[PDB]
């Protein structure tokens, strides 16, 4: 069997030695990367949307990886990105995002909760959303400068290719495994939710991802693939630019 099932319909799939994709199937099949470094540090990129999914993920991480330390990197300000911060903190993980991601999270938190919960089209999901209280990351770097983590010389590179799915979207590259977590700016079929998107800039932003020697590219939603994920995304963004007359 090619996956393991967790509570709240999370799925964990192994894509490499020490690398898993955990997918929150209740909330739009949101992908979270979990990569164990050689020195025992567990790096988590993105998050499930809310507290029950995040707690389920961390339970599974503690059990299966026995991390010496966990570092969680928010990819953008949406809930698939910041929705895990509350539980990441409570479970002793070190949470990181860009400054802009933190600011947009704080701004989003001012919006009327009830109205914002209407996006969700099943009552249990709405309830879980309202039951959580998303917070920004505790640690912050400058968006345009990005940040390189070093775990005993194993590098994790976070960088900002430009606005696309959102103004703050960052990618996470692991040069050792040639792994790019492109997040929600990887859209090989259709762009999806446009509420924070910059469609006109998206082709150029995705194009900057081509410099990464990626064996595997992981999107925010749906199945992962190779370097071609980026090229498809550019084609998709460019088609949208055309249809919207931008």
Residue 162's φ and ψ, nearest 5 degrees, are 125, 160
37 binds Cl ion (CB under 5 A): no
x/- track of binding to Cl ion for residues 210-239 (CB under 5 A): ----------x-------------------
Residue 206's φ and ψ, nearest 5 degrees, are -65, -35
x/- track of binding to Cl ion for residues 174-203 (CB under 5 A): ----------x-------x-----------
Q: Which does 222 bind (CB under 5 to 8 A by kind): Zn ion, Cl ion, none?
A: none
Angle between helices 123-131 and 51-65 (to 10 degrees): 80
The annotation status of 138 as a binding-site residue, yes or no, is no
**CA end-to-end distance (rounded Å), the chain:** 46
What residues from 82 to 111 belong to the interface with Cl ion (CB under 5 A)? 108
* Closest separation in Å from C-beta 39 to Cl ion: 32
User: What are the residues binding Zn ion (CB under 5 A)?
Assistant: 5, 78, 80, 184, 220
Chain-centroid distance of CA 148 in Å reads 17
* Closest separation in Å from C-beta 30 to Zn ion: 6
Interatomic CA distance for residues 159 and 92, integer angstroms: 25
The annotation status of 78 as a binding-site residue, yes or no, is yes
List, in sequence order, every residue forming a beta bridge with 141; answer none if it has no partner.
Answer: 98
Residue 46, helix vs strand vs coil: coil
Known binding-site positions for Zn(2+) = 3, 5, 76, 78, 80, 86, 133, 165, 184, 221
């Amino acid at each position: 069997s090619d996956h393991v099932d967790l509570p709240y319909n999370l799925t964990a799939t192994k894509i490499d030695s020490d690398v898993f994709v955990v997918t929150d199937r209740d909330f739009y099949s949101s992908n979270v990367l979990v990569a164990k470094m050689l020195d025992g540090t567990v790096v988590i990129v993105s998050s499930p949307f809310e507290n029950l999914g995040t707690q389920t993920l961390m339970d599974w991480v503690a059990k299966t990886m026995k991390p010496k330390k966990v570092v969680a990197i928010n990819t953008h300000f949406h809930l698939d990105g910041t929705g895990g911060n509350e539980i990441y903190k409570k479970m002793g993980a070190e949470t990181w995002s860009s400054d802009l991601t933190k600011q947009l999270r704080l701004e989003e938190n001012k919006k009327d909760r009830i109205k914002a919960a209407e996006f969700y089209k099943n009552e249990d999901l709405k309830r879980r959303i309202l039951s959580s209280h998303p917070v920004p990351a505790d640690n912050v770097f400058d968006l345009k400068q990005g940040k390189v983590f070093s775990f005993s010389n194993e590098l994790v590179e976070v960088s900002f290719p430009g606005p696309a799915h959102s103004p703050d979207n960052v990618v996470v590259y692991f040069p050792k495994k040639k792994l790019l977590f492109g997040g929600c700016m990887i859209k090989p079929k259709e762009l999806g939710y446009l509420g924070d998107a910059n469609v006109k800039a998206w082709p150029d932003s995705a194009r900057r991802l081509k410099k990464f020697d990626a064996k595997i590219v992981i999107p925010g939603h749906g199945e992962w693939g190779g370097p071609e994920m980026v090229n498809k995304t550019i084609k998709v963004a460019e088609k949208a630019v055309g249809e919207m007359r931008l």
